[PDB]
From a paper:
Defensins, a family of cysteine-rich cationic host defence peptides, are a major component of the innate immune systems of all plant and animal species, however crocodilian defensins are poorly characterised. We now report the functional and structural characterisation of Crocodylus porosus β-defensin 13 (CpoBD13). We now show that the saltwater crocodile defensin CpoBD13 harbors potent antifungal activity that is mediated by a pH-dependent membrane-targeting action. CpoBD13 binds the phospholipid phosphatidic acid (PA) to form a large helical oligomeric complex, with specific histidine residues mediating PA binding.
To understand the structural basis of CpoBD13 activity, we determined its atomic structure using X-ray crystallography. A single copy of CpoBD13 was found in the asymmetric unit, with clear and continuous density observed for the entire protein chain. CpoBD13 adopts a fold comprising the family-defining structural elements observed in mammalian β-defensins comprising a single α-helix and a three-stranded β-sheet, which are connected via three disulphide bonds. A Dali analysis of CpoBD13 revealed that human β-defensin-2 (HBD-2) is the closest structural homologue in the Protein Data Bank (PDB), with a rmsd of 0.8 Å (Z-score 6.2) over 40 Cα atoms, and a peptide sequence identity of 26% (only I26 and K38 are conserved in addition to the cysteine residues that form the structurally critical disulphide bonds). An overlay of the two defensin structures revealed that residue H35 of CpoBD13 was located in the same position as the key lipid binding residue K36 in HBD-2. We surmised that if the activity of CpoBD13 is as conserved with HBD-2 as its tertiary structure, the co-localisation of these amino acids could indicate that histidine may play a role in CpoBD13–lipid interactions. Our findings reveal that despite limited primary sequence identity, the three-dimensional structure of CpoBD13 bears a striking resemblance to HBD-2, suggesting strong evolutionary conservation of the β-defensin structure between humans and reptiles.
Numbering used by the authors: 1 to 38
């Protein structure tokens, strides 16, 4: 599925293994250890 990845997109986040400084871990994208970072 891509639903969670797409929702990261819709939320203006980025799917990352680790969130960058200043970014909040607001969800997960699809895939393994793909975190939605905003």
């Amino acid at each position: 599925s891509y639903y969670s990845t797409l929702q990261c997109r819709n939320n203006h986040g980025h799917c990352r293994r680790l969130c960058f400084h200043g970014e909040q871990w607001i969800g997960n994208c699809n895939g393994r250890h793909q975190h939605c970072c905003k």
